[PDB]
Amino acid sequence: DTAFVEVVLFESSPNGDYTTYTTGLQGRFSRAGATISAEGEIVQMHPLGDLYEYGWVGVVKLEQPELDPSCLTVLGKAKRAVQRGATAVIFDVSENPDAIDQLNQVSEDPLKRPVVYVKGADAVKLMNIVNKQKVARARIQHR
Amino acid sequence: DTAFVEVVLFETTYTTGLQGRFSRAGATISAEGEIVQMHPLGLCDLYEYGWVGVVKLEQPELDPSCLTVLGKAKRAVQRGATAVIFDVSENPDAIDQLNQVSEDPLKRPVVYVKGADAVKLMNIVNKQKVARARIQHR
């Protein structure tokens, strides 16, 4: 159920040595995808509708549905991301907390990759890193 | 302690599994990254952060490496590896070295494979790149 999200910042010396910095975060695995570990470069997704090498983690901030103009539901977004090569997808569901029920509903065919949600403190934390800059890596762990 | 290694291959996407073990040289955790062939002897190349290194160890008395098995694990992590996987078929003693009661375990997993599991891994590495590993602790 619980997904431990480790966000990695890293920098290299021009002699190829890396120093990594890590910051922890919690969400939940949803029934929309599998309960397994995942790891990849973070990509902030954008609503409207391959743009990236296979293996990315998609991060989506959802908006309040009454005001949401998007075509894709939360489940539509999870599906597309995986079709387009994501190894996992993390949704921020603070604006749309019905989205959890939607992601946890009985699944006609659940995706092979993790579909995780965060909210509260842990989302502000995520979106502060997703915005601040790219080149962050997400480790999604299942304990 | 068993480590489940799923390898993703491309041409569009398909999967194929195999098993090994988590050594005490590193942690017991999951990791995932593009596979990178590590040379059986290195130094004695810069990559993107987050690769999974994979190397076949030679018999130690035939091994010209500057780096011990541990040394290759630490160096791989320094150079941005998310995990390291050793085929230890030809060096059983590498197992005892990776399992030393260690004050100094790495935060990343340091896995080893052998027998047919390893033959399957190394064949993928020898052939050509565009492979990605996911290491799971079930």
Numbering used by the authors:
A (entry chain A): 31 to 79, 88 to 181
B (entry chain B): 31 to 41, 49 to 81, 88 to 181
What did the authors write?
Rspo (R-spondin, also roof plate-specific spondin) proteins are evolutionarily conserved from fish to humans and have well-documented roles in a broad range of developmental and physiological processes resulting from enhancement of canonical and non-canonical Wnt signalling. Direct extracellular interaction with Rspo proteins inhibits ZNRF3/RNF43 activity. Here we report a molecular level analysis of the ZNRF3/RNF43 ectodomain structure and its interactions with Rspo proteins.
The ZNRF3ecto crystal structures revealed a distinctive variant of the protease-associated domain topology. A disulphide bridge, conserved across species, links two structurally elaborate loops, β3–β4 and β4–αA. The crystal structures for apo xZNRF3ecto, zZNRF3ecto and mZNRF3ecto showed no major differences in the main chain conformation. Our crystallographic data provided independent structures for multiple copies of the ZNRF3 ectodomain in eight different crystal forms. This dimer is conserved, and pairwise structural superpositions yielded r.m.s.d. values of <1.3 Å (for 275 equivalent Cα pairs). The interaction is twofold symmetric; strands β3 and β7 of the ‘subunits’ abut face-to-face at the core of the dimer. The β1–β2 hairpin forms a second interface by reaching out to embrace helix αA and the β3–β4 loop in the opposing subunit.
